[PDB]
Amino acid sequence: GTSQWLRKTVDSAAVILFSKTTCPYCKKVKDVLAEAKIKHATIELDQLSNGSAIQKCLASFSKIETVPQMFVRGKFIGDSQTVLKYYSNDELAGIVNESKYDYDLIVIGGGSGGLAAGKEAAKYGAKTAVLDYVEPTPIGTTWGLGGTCVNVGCIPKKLMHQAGLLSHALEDAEHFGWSLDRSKISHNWSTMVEGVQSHIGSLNWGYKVALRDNQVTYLNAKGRLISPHEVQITDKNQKVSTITGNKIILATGERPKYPEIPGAVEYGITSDDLFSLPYFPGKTLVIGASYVALECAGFLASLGGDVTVMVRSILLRGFDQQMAEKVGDYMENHGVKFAKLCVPDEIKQLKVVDTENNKPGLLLVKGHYTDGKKFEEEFETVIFAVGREPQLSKVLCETVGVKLDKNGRVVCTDDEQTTVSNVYAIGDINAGKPQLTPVAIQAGRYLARRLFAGATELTDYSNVATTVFTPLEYGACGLSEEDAIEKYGDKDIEVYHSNFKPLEWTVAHREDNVCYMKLVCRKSDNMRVLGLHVLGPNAGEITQGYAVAIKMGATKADFDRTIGIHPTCSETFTTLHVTKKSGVSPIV
């Protein structure tokens, strides 16, 4: 059992030292490597259980049973005297640099998972390249290093969400005694875009500095895997070349889809364009009903826009539908309009974007409702949020042999391995995994440690908590109510729930019975918490701590016996008692 772990670690590591904490001969070698500025993995054999068995099994590669032993790319290099002989003869640097390949690791894609995989691999001596290239949108929008979240995703959207929230802050301040007139204050879109884009630019720059200070080679070029170990690159001048790597990580992400209808690509935009748009969108139509669509429609309305959402069927497909409907009712009562059971047919241009004076165009949208009735209205901006997809034909040559699924995502084992033994995939293109930035970052960091440091820890993809940052935020961990009932049967499911009102909302005269939370529990398993759901302010900060308890198997009793922090919204989870089966009202 242990023998095949050691073969795997020795064959994959770039520079690895087998050591012991107590040994000073090991200390002698560590310092030689530190002074020579050689980075490497170290496996302190006294700090592991089967450590005495590994010391003996090392001899299969080296013919010695003692410590230290140093390896470079699968090859035994020496004990303390032999490495010191290489240092003293200036043979060391050429030994640790000799490789069959240009790089130990090539990462295709410089986003959340790719940059994390890259930086972590370089820590343990892997010679690493990171490739990133941002294909422009149809109107030519492009951005810097860091991926979807940093440039056109979580970071800009939560910053605009905050701008929206500050509007109700201004309203609330009058009731708390501040002398301002909310009625006489307006919002400047381009001022906000300049602040958001300036922060994004400091992140582009930070990532490039991080790569340089880890000796990671960053190539702003489009990557294409033509064979298991060969990557073809194409730079800004359209110059083609080929580099080789031992291990390959695909981390190229996704991009927004367009519907197959006239005018969409020509006259619409997507979220890729929204976050650096130079003019205010004006009267906007959002087509779609995913979290992206609702989040954007949500802050556009809070900033003062005339906003409409076109919903084919339901909101937030895949999420708990009671919570989804409460999310949607809140938005509808605070000035988002909904065109229900409606799909688009064409977009007609009426005015071209006034690019000089910084103004939007004018469009005609024509569609029909699900019964047959017709839709026709004019908008200044149309935003499509109808899903995202990878396009691995751009990245991946079919002859290489990497299996994809029917959606176009990479089929992987539970350690991210593809059907080609040295190629891996992480992040949104890994089939079946939650498409979330913290997931990609963990997957990337954990894989790098297994490749180049002898680690065994895998990424746990179950019960990952989410938050939808609509004007009233919605946090969740675990199963929706309908999924629990389906998997276990309604007679085994108990649901504790309650409305609540933040203390902050009392003096501000906000609504009484709009915030809501519930625990979905399995009776036959000690009333285990199957899913947690909360609609209210700061839902992400509320939910996050409970994801730890859910990972650990929390039960209703665990929540009961824990004491609240007062006054908070979150404490309401510690005294839930009304069940749905009882019929009692959840109001306060």
Ligand X SMILES: Cc1cc2nc3c(=O)[nH]c(=O)nc-3n(C[C@H](O)[C@H](O)[C@H](O)COP(=O)(O)OP(=O)(O)OC[C@H]3O[C@@H](n4cnc5c(N)ncnc54)[C@H](O)[C@@H]3O)c2cc1C
- Per the annotation, binding residues for NADPH are 157, 289-290, 292, 312-313, 317, 387, 435
d(CA 557, CA 582): 19
Q: Do 161 and 298 form a contact (C-beta atoms < 8 A)?
A: yes
Please list every residue in the chain followed by a chain break, i.e. its C lies more than 2.5 Å from the next written N. none
d(CA 296, CA 552): 35
Binding residues for NAD(+): 288-295, 387
Q: Which of 165, 203, 411, 455 binds ligand NVD (CB under 6 A)?
A: 455
d(CA 228, CA 483): 40
Q: Considering only 131-139, 170-178, 279-287, 349-357, which stretch makes contact with ligand X by CB under 6 A?
A: 131-139
Q: Do 308 and 337 form a contact (C-beta atoms < 8 A)?
A: yes
Per the annotation, the verdict on 368 as an active-site residue is no
Q: Which of 113, 328, 454, 531 binds ligand NVD (CB under 6 A)?
A: 454
* Residues in region 157-216 near ligand X by CB under 6 A: 157
113 binds, among ligand X, a copy of itself, ligand NVD, none (CB under 5 to 8 A by kind): ligand X
- Taking the least distance from each CB to ligand NVD, the nearer of 431 and 455 is 455
- How many residues touch a copy of itself (CB under 8 A)? 76
43 part of the interface to ligand NVD, by CB under 6 A: yes
506 CB-contact burial (10 Å; exposed 0-12 / middle 13-18 / buried 19+): exposed
342 binds, among ligand NVD, ligand X, a copy of itself, none (CB under 5 to 8 A by kind): none
- Taking the least distance from each CB to ligand NVD, the nearer of 1 and 140 is 1
d(CA 29, CA 407): 50
- Residue bearing tokens 């994959």: 12
168 part of the interface to ligand NVD, by CB under 6 A: no
Binding residues: 20, 55, 67, 80-81, 112-114, 132-133, 148-149, 154, 157-158, 222-223, 225, 252, 255, 288-295, 312-313, 317, 387, 391, 397, 428, 435, 437, 483, 509, 560, 562, 566, 574
SS3 readout for 459-510: CCCCCCCEEECCCCCEEEEECCHHHHHHHHCHHHEEEEEEEECCCHHHHCCC
One character per residue 133-152, x = contact with ligand X (rule: CB under 6 A)? xx------------xxx---
Q: Give the angle subtended at the CA of 321 by the CAs of 318 and 324, to the nearest 5°.
A: 95
Cβ partners under 8 Å of residue 352, min gap 6: 361
- Taking the least distance from each CB to a copy of itself, the nearer of 1 and 178 is 178
One character per residue 178-197, x = contact with a copy of itself (rule: CB under 8 A)? xxx----xxxxx-xx--xx-
- How many residues touch ligand X (CB under 6 A)? 34
At closest approach, how far in Å is the CB of 171 from ligand X?
25
Q: Considering only 67-75, 345-353, 446-454, 510-518, which stretch makes contact with ligand NVD by CB under 6 A?
A: 446-454
89 binds, among ligand X, ligand NVD, a copy of itself, none (CB under 5 to 8 A by kind): none
Q: Report the largest interatomic distance among the alpha carbons of the chain, rounded to a whole angstrom.
A: 86
548 binds, among ligand NVD, ligand X, a copy of itself, none (CB under 5 to 8 A by kind): a copy of itself
* Residues in region 522-581 near ligand X by CB under 6 A: 566
Q: Considering only 60-68, 143-151, 154-162, 447-455, which stretch makes contact with ligand NVD by CB under 6 A?
A: 447-455
Cis-peptide into 156, omega within 30 deg: no
Q: Do 381 and 281 form a contact (C-beta atoms < 8 A)?
A: yes
At closest approach, how far in Å is the CB of 400 from a copy of itself?
31
Q: Considering only 41-49, 110-118, 203-211, 453-461, which stretch makes contact with ligand X by CB under 6 A?
A: 110-118
Residue number of the CB atom closest to ligand X: 111
Q: Which of 68, 78, 113, 288 binds ligand X (CB under 6 A)?
A: 113
d(CA 414, CA 454): 17
* Residues in region 40-69 near ligand X by CB under 6 A: none
Binding residues for FAD: 112-114, 132-133, 148-149, 154, 157-158, 222-223, 252, 255, 291, 391, 428, 435, 437, 566
341 binds, among a copy of itself, ligand NVD, ligand X, none (CB under 5 to 8 A by kind): none
381 part of the interface to ligand X, by CB under 6 A: no
Residues in the chain: 588
Put the strands of the sheet holding 307-311 in their side by side order: 337-340, 307-311, 284-287, 381-384
- Residue bearing tokens 């294909």: 135
d(CA 458, CA 455): 9
Q: Which of 8, 158, 366, 368 binds a copy of itself (CB under 8 A)?
A: 158
At 379, list the tokens.
């908008």
Q: Which of 284, 308, 430, 437 binds a copy of itself (CB under 8 A)?
A: 437
444 part of the interface to ligand NVD, by CB under 6 A: no
Q: Considering only 141-149, 204-212, 305-313, 453-461, which stretch makes contact with ligand NVD by CB under 6 A?
A: 453-461
Element (H, E) at 526: none
d(CA 231, CA 534): 46
Q: How many Cβ atoms sit within 10 Å of the Cβ of residue 184? A: 6
Put the strands of the sheet holding 528-535 in their side by side order: 466-468, 474-478, 528-535, 515-522, 493-500
Q: Which of 114, 125, 361, 475 binds ligand X (CB under 6 A)?
A: 114
d(CA 210, CA 268): 36
DSSP H helical ranges for 58-153: 59-62, 80-88, 92-97, 112-123, 148-152
- Taking the least distance from each CB to ligand NVD, the nearer of 43 and 404 is 43
Cβ partners under 8 Å of residue 338, min gap 6: 308, 309, 311, 328, 331, 332
- Using CB under 6 A as the criterion, which residues of the chain lie in contact with ligand X when the complex forms? 108-114, 131-134, 147-149, 153-154, 157, 222-223, 251-253, 271, 292, 394-395, 427-428, 435-438, 440, 566
Catalytic residues: 566
- Using CB under 6 A as the criterion, which residues of the chain lie in contact with ligand NVD when the complex forms? 41, 43, 449, 453-456
